[model samples]
Target chain A: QALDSDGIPTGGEWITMFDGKTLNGWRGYCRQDVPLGWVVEDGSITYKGSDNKADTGFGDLIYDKKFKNFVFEIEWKIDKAGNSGIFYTAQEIEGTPIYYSSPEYQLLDNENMPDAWEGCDGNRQAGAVYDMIMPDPQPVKPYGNWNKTRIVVYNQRVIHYMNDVKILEFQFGTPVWRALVDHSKFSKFSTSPEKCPEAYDLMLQCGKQPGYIGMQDHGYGVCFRNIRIKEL
Target chain B: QALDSDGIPTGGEWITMFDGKTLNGWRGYCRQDVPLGWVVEDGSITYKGSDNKADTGFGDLIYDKKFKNFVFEIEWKIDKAGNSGIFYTAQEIEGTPIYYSSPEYQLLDNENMPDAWEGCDGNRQAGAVYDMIMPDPQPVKPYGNWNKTRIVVYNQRVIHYMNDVKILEFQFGTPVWRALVDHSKFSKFSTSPEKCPEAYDLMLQCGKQPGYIGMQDHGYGVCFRNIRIKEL
Candidate 1:
């Protein structure tokens, strides 16, 4: 088999993760269809905040199929002061948020978003491993400009790229990975009943397993296109 | 060879990058010995501000021996509002600053250092690839607390870690790397002689050759210890 620069088999056909015209292969986490605020517009998956409607709590949109190890790519842009994320290793539990199990590739407007600077460091900024590993020299284009992202997951190792630049890499289930999880916000849900009562039991039920690929609906305006993947 | 959890060769004997008791095997970038501001104290390499001494301009402390394709590790801490860096792929050119050729692993107090937040994204924060790549979810400890860092360079791919969490990675001599260099502050020196006349000639002298490992003397109080390395 032919291998790519990263040593991953690349001769296989590429699969479309998101169809340009519709959300055909996607659904809300734990739900049967896309949520209220997610829509397809102008060849991109777009999210517009709910119009102050009740029962429209924010959630994530996940691919229907579960993946074990693969390479995924997408192009995304955000509105001013926006927030979002791409999630992997995400399993849907009855009463838990996707972040309870999945790790996130953070997406944000670091230049305009106030929350981007509120974290312990820059980990919450764009291209970060959510609350875990921050992307150094973040190459994200400004808001309203599309930035290309690539993710490679093989064996237990994950690498994140932004705008064609490889930015970060880590191995899951390592002592370091477990330590990062233990110190992050996700750990709070498992131990604090008063703070995460709704998610407490569900958080404990899930194990680290192959799960869906997802995008966060963080009540912001974010657009994504050209989502493709290759399974190794 | 046995490797560490981070995939850095570990079974091989480690070479001490810093002796913790002296400035042995180290010297200023272009000079023959350690500079005045660099001192050995309490089992760490500490940098005190220049004591208003003449002929003592700011400089970098480079390892006398050059290396290629190795894993390097160190523990460092900074005072409040401090700035520093670890420079690699560095070669000494006559009449040039170390940054003219070497790429740096940025070190800063992201919470207190103003420069940490002034870049395109969070790229200037701790563990970042200097001005080229921003670290996401920076795992740096607060100022005054030590943070362990690791860099693995093997077959042209470079990975950076902060406290065991892999924060970023990139390949040197690639088109993406060249583009980053062309657009960064380092590129400006080559085009703007009026701004960086002394560095103009030296900037063009170096390419992607294996050279020296150096620590920046950014006029701040920073301490480094447990500096060790293993060839891959």
Candidate 2:
């Protein structure tokens, strides 16, 4: 048995992904250096948004290591009207974005973010598996309050939990998953109909194996802390 | 194991309190007739405000049987800007309201109800133990949507749960419970400066033993259904 820094028994091999003060195990999504949008502060990681340029400035601030089937937990706080996302099982597709290859655990202010009410499926709210599922109970705290989120990927099923309530669960690559993708924004990653230039097929190829973990923003001032993972 | 109607397995004896179609086992808080404020409709029991006449118009509609140590579960829905309370271990004081004599599981639309943000402690929101305790991460569904609530009283501790999330738990008659009461509206049931007169003592005397199960509302159009109980 191992004890974590918070004085709770870890029960298993739980690793602290983010040190309190520095970017020890982090790098830019594509660039090797840590991204410009992210900073380590106030015992948490804060993302302010990128340069909106893929090559010159850093994209998503991705952790240097990847995780396999595991239980990952993080605590996050968003500014009023802010929105962001957490990507897991992410691939570094050349000339492509991380979101297209990984599933996202949405992080947004459900009380103030306009995206909270958008989308026909209402899966754009916090604690959702981004567009693929909606959090039924949606037990997220209000804006500017810290919320605890836990994601468990094991036995081919991915589960999302917020503030200790199970948000949603779905099996990988199932017909239900495919149906959700077909009707989501992920269905059309590009505009040109003729070319397969790194097409939307990568959206279907998520969580099959281990990949990098990433955090990025749609709106700014998202803070995350206590990021930890336990291999199952 | 017995499978309930919803196809979930019930491992123990669970008594159906509300028969869904009839008010067979209910009565007024102080009278034999089921209260005028309550009606059985659409597989649910609803509470419209009474005539504000406690003796003639009926007040809180309570159940006939009392539960000593049990697990009670129900589903509730509130109209827009509606508010309500569920009382357990409720005593029938000679003149005092049911609220002054029992602990309340607060039910109100967190988004539309004004009481959603009331009180300095922020404990007046839904899924809370009313003024005495608050449900953090308040996992209430939106207004006009059904939310499941479970109350567990065992081993001298009471637990409040909403939408499968454990909301709050507190031990009976402890210093922690007293401190919560001293800082809440329950600290003063009335304004008489002297004389017992069956005074505010009952506020401190809650859940000590078996008593009636009651539900009444602050606002209008509060509905409850699937009321069930299993002794611990």
Candidate 3:
């Protein structure tokens, strides 16, 4: 969970997704530079709710490149009831919410915001895979506390890790994938039923390569640091 | 696992390592040409035992290159009481048997093998990290029948898979790794203890890159085909 000066996740070979000092490798969803109130301090990127109308609208901080098979690790912290997500294979849909084209690994404050979309919940409250799958029972640090997460995508297999404990592993594009997709609200979306769809809008789409990495700004205050990846 | 002329596994992406033609990419261990008796028939390479013996009195057929961080899938059928292994991280080891230097994912007929080493018994049975770990208590196809085998190494983790069931997973370099090595009878061999030292060896050393894919010819009649890897 600790980060070296370069923002590489300690004890692992992940290059910093976020260059602690500035947003050199990141760009706004529809803009060129960092917007107001989004500042880098103490090696962490913080988004403070502004006096002006917060840019609560959909926006994504996207990394420049795309990856096919890889292991990605990052650390995140959120304010009370904060909501955010780490998205992969993300792309821009013609006209919809920014996340419409991406598969998300949800990050949230479950203890504070017990109810959101899923009415009944427990430890699986905030950080669950948005009602698709619940995580193992692990102590959740209070609000403003940082948590480490790691995700592995090898071929069609995907694994989600919270605090080093493997919570879920499911093969994408298989019948099991369709079963999981059909059981979730994502199935409500026109594209959701097609688990691991051939034409995911969010994928890298770089010369047959499939996907890219991204972070979601879900209209709440959250901070992230030490994001990195190990290409498979 | 039968492979049709279409060049795919009975399932998806799973194919016999050999295509029932010629030994295109395989060659004699440390030698440039395919040795005598290592021939292809009905889509498999059969080792009929060696005719010529060199200084060390050992012979082997090895895959041309090394592989690391991959899901290696292959199928093999062994004679009763036969012995063979799939070696990885193989490199030239001075004055020693080539298999002595490489770590192997064992391929054996446990129920019939007369010389099956003790610890190398059930726990280190077929589809295992040779002489080190065992496959889970999953039923393996009887000898003379083609038993599907898969070995996956990603980061420090290793999985032994047989007949579609994952039997064992052990991190390559943890105390568990050492304990497995120390307790094995092979520990007495001068080169055995250090033979597979540095769990990172397969990931870092032995060549331009740490991962290399190879197979062991345990001087037995064994057939192997459909070898493939998808980087982790």
Candidate 4:
């Protein structure tokens, strides 16, 4: 039996994203504890940057494991102009930033920070695939506030949600996504970051999964909390 | 002269969305001063929310003026299980929540929070229009981090974006949107708050004109910063 919104465990079983107290099933990349500046305070891991600074120099915060075709959910926020991002199907590649190995969810300040220097203001900012796509506009709360985000990554179909609104939905490797990547600057890079050698790596596999759940420090002050997930 | 990513005017005339430090031409909803919780920080107005407590009550940071068609942009974020939304072609309907009186851009968190909760988690959480449609999956940052968002609202076309990703794009008042509204729960309400009668009030008057920019504060601790816009 599947559980409903009340969390009564209506289903016979379900996967727990977080245990609430510690990083039980989750681990940080390159280390056991979460990266510097990332703390699990009050049952939620918070990322706070220096006073009046852009962000921490840490490259990205990655989970010790990976997944495929799963349902993931997290809560997050940022200071004014504060920046960060989420990586999926990510792995450590030789001779490049570890995050470069996976596709990214674009996170930036579109209202204040200068993000879209090339394209139109439409579909080119936060909640987007850096330079590739943008999330719908639902006027998510202002900076420094908590917002709920959900991603359903299954096969080639992907959907993004902010607050209670479904802002963006699309498919990877699809003609549209391919065309966009090909025309974007990533197309020119000999080793384009968007290039996914193993599409299956992007989805959450059954039982236990592998891959890294990294957070881009972006050298700025940001925070995250109440991150939990359920297996599809 | 237009400017590049490096922030240098290149001596070529270009369009700008919002000038830092002021809501000069932009009007507010109901009143002025950027509504509660919406503040100007770091040359931009940031919108954020507190915990899931809605004790503060619910209200909309509506645009004081109106419009027809235009392009707009803003950055946003939310805490875990946080909820909020955006609406256009809005009007002052005689109803409890103005959202029922406007065509909205759904904002929600689809992961931990089911699409039925009030804040942080729900189907209508971040980038969705309360059961109307969903957004594509672009990359996203953790809580407390900012995400840039953009929208192109025209006579026949309405595009929603997140983090530079074009998640969902469709025509306004088309057969699809109309059918969606007809099937939504709001259709049960004796009043048409879910569907506004004035579909051109808050829109940009002309192709490239001015209009009111409103923010929604659904009693949750949501914030917005660096709020700006350019006449399309």
Tell me how each candidate scores on DockQ against the true complex.
Answer: 0.03, 0.01, 0.02, 0.01
Better of 1 and 2 by DockQ: 1
User: lDDT per residue, candidate 3, B27-139, as tens digits?
Assistant: 76667777776778678877775566655333577666666666678888887877778776567553455654555777777887654545333444676655555555555
The full ranking of all candidates by TM-score, starting with the best, is: 1, 2, 3, 4
Q: Residues B49-102, candidate 1: write the lDDT tens digits.
A: 566667664478988988778888999989999889998778777667787776
Better of 2 and 4 by lDDT: 2
Error of 1 at B121 (Å): 1.0
lDDT for each of the candidates? 0.74, 0.72, 0.59, 0.52
Clashes of each: 15, 0, 21, 156
Give lDDT: candidate 1, residue A78. Answer: 92
Question: Largest TM-score belongs to which candidate?
Answer: 1
Model 4, range B1-232, lDDT digits (tens) per residue?
Answer: 4643322233422344346665554433544444445555566544554454554434466655565555566766666655556666565543345555555666544454555343211225455555544455644456557777766665545666778776555554332333334334444311334444343322212123333346566534344555544443
lDDT of 4 at B225: 54
Which residue pairs of candidate 2 clash? none
TM-scores of the models, in the order given: 0.53, 0.47, 0.43, 0.42
Q: What lDDT is reached at residue A145 by model 3?
A: 83
Once fitted onto the true fold, the runs of candidate 2 whose alpha carbons sit more than 4 angstroms away are: A1-11, A49-58, A188-199, A217-219, B1-232
What fraction of correct interface contacts does each candidate retain? 0.00, 0.00, 0.00, 0.00
Candidate 1: list runs displaced more than 4 Å: A1-6, A10-232, B1-8, B56-58, B188-207
Per-candidate iRMSD:
12.3, 19.2, 14.8, 14.2
DockQ, candidate no. 2: 0.01
- Pick by DockQ: which candidate is best? 1
* TM-score, model 3, chain B versus true chain B: 0.76
